[PDB]
Symmetry: C3
Subunit: 226 residues, 3 copies
């Protein structure tokens, strides 16, 4: 099976660990053994002019996933929304009410349907590829999330006297001479990881530590040596 998935993750935090805005939207191609991705795309947001509430992310995600899918022709696209695996081209007012989600979730998706359903429909017509709202269940979506963490740190290195990056849940990053490696901290996930080439700037220091206000989320903090 060959899967394209997408996710948005990584946030700039203020000094009291409150998120300001999100950083990276990433689409990944994932193939057996489903532990990493070697082909991916990134779109960076502007975290300082981001509306955290909300849902530009999912629109950016589906667009980027389709863009990558047109190049690599996967079997399926996984979208990061836990709706039971329903095909997005089949999302209408009727099918959304039948969904086992909260009443806010239903109204959010009734609005999102207006743009996303025709998009998925046109893409399925062209290719036969479904876009499914699978979310938390998907390993490719979790690999996309790890890459969103990595690219958030890349963005921070490229855009830093100090920056706090809130990473996606329970993942770590490691800085190497010419690359950033991201890994899940959950061994139950079976060793999921990512790697992105980058040049690491001089004159800065970094540390990774637990976000004290959000258990199981880590903070990557960059500080200037000057």
């Amino acid at each position: 099976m060959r899967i394209v998935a997408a996710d948005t993750g990584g946030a700039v935090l203020d000094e009291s660990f409150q998120p300001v805005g999100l950083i990276a939207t990433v689409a990944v191609l994932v193939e057996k053994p489903y532990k990493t991705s070697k082909r991916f795309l990134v779109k960076y947001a502007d975290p300082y002019n981001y509306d955290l509430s909300g849902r530009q992310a999912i629109r950016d995600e589906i667009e980027l996933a389709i863009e990558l899918a047109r190049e690599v022709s996967p079997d399926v696209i996984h979208l990061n929304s836990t709706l039971g695996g329903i095909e997005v081209r089949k999302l209408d007012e009727s099918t959304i009410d039948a969904l086992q989600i909260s009443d806010r979730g239903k109204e959010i998706w009734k609005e999102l349907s207006k743009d996303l359903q025709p998009l998925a429909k046109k893409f399925w017509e062209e290719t036969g590829i479904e876009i499914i709202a699978i979310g938390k269940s998907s390993v490719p979506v979790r690999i996309a999330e790890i890459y969103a963490g990595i690219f958030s740190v890349k963005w921070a290195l490229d855009n830093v006297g100090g920056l706090l990056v809130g990473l996606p849940r329970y993942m770590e990053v490691e800085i190497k001479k010419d690359k950033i490696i991201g890994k899940s901290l959950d061994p139950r996930e079976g060793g999921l990881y990512g790697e992105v080439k980058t040049e690491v700037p001089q004159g800065i220091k970094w540390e990774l530590y637990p976000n004290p206000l959000v258990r199981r989320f880590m903070v990557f903090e960059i500080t200037s040596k000057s």
Copy 2:
């Protein structure tokens, strides 16, 4: 305390990772320090003629657990159903509605009661040993589950041009010349493991990797060198 527990686990998957049927039912004796089992029984199902909605699994589990219990005389039997630890001999329509479980769960157990309650009652009459529906809370149940994973792999090695075995949640297997070792991938469980003797066939290769459709579950795939 000395505990007998049982579980059914391991599934044949098709090439799109959809389960076809379950493989192994295992009963274990677990004693201090409650990390493994040295005395156990296995019953193999036929996964290609399995009713995944049938729920023959729990009938097989209680039967195999009672069979092992008659040999080793434990303090208690742990059954894999998370009902709050109620004794199975006490399961009637009255006690089932009082349980804090789903209405689907209540309707399943009202039907299961008709066979299982008399079975547990007669075993308690004979021995004084309770069969309790403890499920997810039980470490002996998790150890039975790990052994079901190991035995599913043994079954696959013995019955394979290629096979996909979906393992129980977050566990790995290791193949040695003369045995299979199974371990939980969750360090929070305190190091649960199992080991089964077997002959490993020639002319085949194997791989263990994440199920892309079911996060925190692994696939053990066997392929012929053919």
Copy 3:
């Protein structure tokens, strides 16, 4: 950020692994990098005369947290009750009705409000420090919990003809010549740990293993 948090944890178990009563209430000061605590206080309960339904735990916790806070002057106090981070000084029946929790949870806290809310208000007046009900989301709270586990083992060392101590969730302890080290078993938490100096008595054996009745909780067993 500088944080005081508190928790009650660790339990005496009987021979069928049933809890009898809780042991340690611990207040910790937590600072960057938020992985441990070097400054903490402990209050021991009497586990053989403990009411597990009583919610004396949270009253002991807030008192000890305040006691430590007066000494180390933190930015905020984290209380181990998952109410979304609401300020305790702002807890009246109306705000409790609005909380996204169970109806039992609501009835418990309407009763707790009667004593704890005036305490938080007066403390906020004195220092400007909030006491927020953040609970499961707080790392300092988990560090307090790990320290409760450590102190429960210290209690066991101090009181052992044989004892079974049920530790807080997924943590381990190690006894060294002059200290007890506690660690989270969950690597997702990022390496949380604690350490307490104590004199280790002679003539004893100990073992750590899974509670067979409560998955992901360990038992510390000590014998003379």
